[PDB]
């Protein structure tokens with residue numbers, strides 16, 4: 246019976262992206278081959294089964310640096326990180342495979358399913 | 368031109384609320400009279416001009432405890448914290464004044480405007 250604010254969650258996520266853009270309260274660096282990306286672990290955990298499983302473990306919860314698998318494409322990772330913080334997924338014919346494989350590794354199943362639809366549409 | 372995931376932001380916020388419920392990566396305690404509430408500073412900053420202005424300042428960014436003004440009603444604060452993490456605002460005839468005054472202090476203008484509409488509707 247509570248009053249629903251239909252743009253509140255989008256507003257929150259937009260503001261979290263602003264904080265990331267300013268490096269405010271970012272608490273991890275994700276290293277992907279020669280590139281580095283800062284983020285909030287809470288957002289990563291909210292959006293990825295890989296990051297959820299890492300940081301939920303009390304053994305790895307306080308890690309400040311995560312080295313991803315060396316074969317992960319940094320562009321694919323960057324597209325997915327941007328998706329996490331914007332709800333918008335930059336899928337293109339030139340990047341679909343990289344994005345889909347990276348989403349599999351990150352355990353982002355709805356994104357993988359959407360990549361499977363993009364392939365079905367060419 | 369990117370693909371829009373229309374429930375992504377709501378899903379993120381729901382997962383952040385799950386993390387709060389488990390005290391995972393919470394980084395502040397808000398003390399309101401005799402009560403204490405743990406939260407993520409990033410979500411507080413995203414939702415309140417008071418918390419934004421506090422934690423953006425490099426002098427107070429690493430504070431782990433914030434004592435709110437002693438006159439703030441803890442119930443009003445709890446309703447607003449729940450709103451921050453759910454997009455749902457528990458406004459009732461028995462709590463409207465407390466919620467509205469607390470939202471003013473937290474600098475949550477859209478919520479204050481909604482409290483002004485609730486009053487206009489009785």
Ligand SMILES: Nc1nc2c(ccn2CC(=O)Nc2ccncc2Cl)c(=O)[nH]1
Pocket residue numbers: 290291292293294295297352353354355382383385386
């Ligand atoms: N395994 C897997 N995890 C995923 C997605 C999408 C998102 N997450 C993460 C997720 O659910 N996090 C979460 C769950 C429960 N409480 C708190 C949190 Cl932060 C997916 O497709 N697969």
Ligand SMILES: Nc1nc2c(ccn2CC(=O)Nc2ccncc2Cl)c(=O)[nH]1
Pocket residue numbers: 260261263264412413414415416417419474475476477
């Ligand atoms: N003063 C004031 N602040 C508010 C609201 C609602 C939300 N916020 C906070 C906010 O905008 N945070 C923000 C802004 C820019 N970049 C990052 C972040 Cl986290 C309000 O009504 N008034």
Ligand SMILES: [Cl-]
Pocket residue numbers: 268269270271428
């Ligand atoms: Cl910081």
Ligand SMILES: [Cl-]
Pocket residue numbers: 306390391392393
């Ligand atoms: Cl923790």
